[PDB]
Amino acid sequence: MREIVHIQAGQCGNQIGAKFWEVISDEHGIDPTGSYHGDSDLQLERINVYYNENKYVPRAILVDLEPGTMDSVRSGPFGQIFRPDNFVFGQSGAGNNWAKGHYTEGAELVDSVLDVVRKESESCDCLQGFQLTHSLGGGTGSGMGTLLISKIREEYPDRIMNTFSVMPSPKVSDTVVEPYNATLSVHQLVENTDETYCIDNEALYDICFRTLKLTTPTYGDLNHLVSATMSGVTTCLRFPGQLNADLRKLAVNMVPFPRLHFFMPGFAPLTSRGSQQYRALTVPELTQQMFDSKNMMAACDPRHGRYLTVAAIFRGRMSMKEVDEQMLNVQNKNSSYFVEWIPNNVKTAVCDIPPRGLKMSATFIGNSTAIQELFKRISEQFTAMFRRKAFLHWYTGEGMDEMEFTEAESNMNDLVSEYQQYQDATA
């Protein structure tokens, strides 16, 4: 009815993309062969948003410049659910170089990706738009992913473009050029996406390590959090409901100025199994946790800025009256942190189906000016390198000019100033 086409690019993008599909397939009662075996009609009612149709096949395109991650996806759990012809991969790799993904190797592959995008799009009853999963700190997801965004946008200019964009952190990768690849990518996202979930590896790491007490978090551990979040933030798109039920309604509610389209996602509950013995899982606990810095998947403290807009989704069996009351309370006690010139800027949905293994959960989507803290962190790492022209030859050797770096940096600094402007504005 209102289809979304999903693209996953590069290593990170394919890894979190595969977990997204495993988790939502389980939620909708779809098994690894594509057969429906669930128990609630809620599961099938909007299945067409994500699955073609006695089997259900993800509307999903898997892209990479080398075969290895996609080979493991294919042999992973749920790997035979994907359409075989929707795997598009080269052999070269991108060498963790954005320029190779965006301008050289990625450019050589992009038309064959577009062929598949078009085939999926053309058999849609009424395509809403696109969701991309990728990292910003590598080469393929970052460089080729942003290339695909601009190419798709040319052919589908009035459709929504949404990303799940994984931001780098020195706590997770020591690859030294990550700040360059991320700054060049943010430059593209600012101009060419409608809505971006900022999934910060810094925050995923700190949640794993400090809250869940995992001494040495794996990508697996990080991705489990991401898949919880991605499930949460797509709940309104794929289950019956009132609020934010499609990509464009979400954008209209969440994006007051076109460039300010970078969301801080958050998930509750996030409590260690040992602390679970002490703390009950209740609506007030979810509500308190979802507005806490420690539950945000971007490493920014919302109390260091203000909220332009917020979407709160609760999942599971619970009292609607108690939800309304807690959501009013949390707004009242936090009133300073919600801009006064956007009245009624927090919306609340409830879906009766919880995530697997929880009685209830909540998901937060914040458009907060405190997201400037993430861009500033990237910006500081970028400039420490660029001031010394470190490692530029990898990018100029692909034909880029220093001017493009200066321009990406300036654009990202301008984004930061714009968040500050609206943070400081009053009624």
Binding site: M1, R2, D125, C126, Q128, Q242, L243, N244, D246, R248, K249, A251, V252, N253, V255, P256, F257, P258, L308, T309, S319, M320, K321, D324, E340, W341, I342, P343, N344, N345, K347, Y422, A425, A427
Partner: protein
Amino acid sequence: RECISIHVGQAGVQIGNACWELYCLEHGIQPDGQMPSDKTIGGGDDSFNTFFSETGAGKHVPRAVFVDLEPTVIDEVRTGTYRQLFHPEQLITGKEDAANNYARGHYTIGKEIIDLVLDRIRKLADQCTGLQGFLVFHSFGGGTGSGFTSLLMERLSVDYGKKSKLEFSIYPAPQVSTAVVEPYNSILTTHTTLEHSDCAFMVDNEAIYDICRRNLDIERPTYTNLNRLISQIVSSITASLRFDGALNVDLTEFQTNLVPYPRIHFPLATYAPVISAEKAYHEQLSVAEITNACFEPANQMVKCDPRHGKYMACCLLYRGDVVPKDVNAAIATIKTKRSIQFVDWCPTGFKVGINYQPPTVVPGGDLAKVQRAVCMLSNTTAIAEAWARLDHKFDLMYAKRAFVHWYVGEGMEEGEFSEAREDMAALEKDYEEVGVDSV
């Protein structure tokens, strides 16, 4: 003297569902459209024929079009309980909605379906021997209810001239709203529609929500709870058109008294009794009780305080076991006791109608079945408070142009926002001016 109902977008459609179900129960029409008590097969000129046409096979078919820019709400009508009541062609859908954006409803998406909707309304009109006018049900806040309604009302002025157009308009509340931009959409549609509408009954979702919570003891009202109450109010208002009787007074005659100047066309509706089965049990609520309840601000369908404005008209629409003697005694008491100041240029007499047909309730509803009910329609300067609240929310966002790019992106200009807001300022000022004393 036919009336054609048009139900636009989700709110207009779901309220239409509730209204048509209630109308069928009030007239004895089954879900398959059969009406065993109607002995004229295939036609006639009964009062109920204002709202229902008849087929030769005995089907009583609403004079109604339902339209929505996406299909999923109208699909429930098409597959649900009353699916046989409507001809398929009366239920019209597109595939992609207006995304809470007036610009999409009035322009980008609306324009693709407007011709077809006008075609279908024309086919209804063509079966009427004396069409009196239209009743249009819509939200203020949604993209379709705002923008498509506006487009449709402009197009109907062109195709039907000054034939009567009345609205039932759903004014937004935060407890059930779905968009941050609802103020913008409300002001845009109020501006665009104002010269095309003869009379508009606003229903504030927050007033209804509150009434449901307070008087029906519903902890967290749903649209279903809200819409069942709204339908009773709508029913009270249209009952004069659908039933006859010696003391029935047509809605158009109330209209004469309600609308002193073309733009001053927004009556305040107040309804009583709203009570649960459990409280209504063993308690007979007299004509005096239900009448005094109409001057309680808590029972009003729009939050505002009439005690702090002036009246330009007061109409009482009774239904059920009500005789003028009891009415007159009740009005006499109320006049000695309440805050009822008229402007100096109007008569202070209350205008009364009585329909004998008792009120009906839908199975599994919240409202007690009662012997007598009343709907007061007043023209008070206090209703302007509702415009001031929306205007203020508009001003807060507009000063920063928050969300305006979504509208501009669909082809609108800033000048349309300032024109709409200027007209609303003029309307607020019109409401002040009419309440000032004559020199």
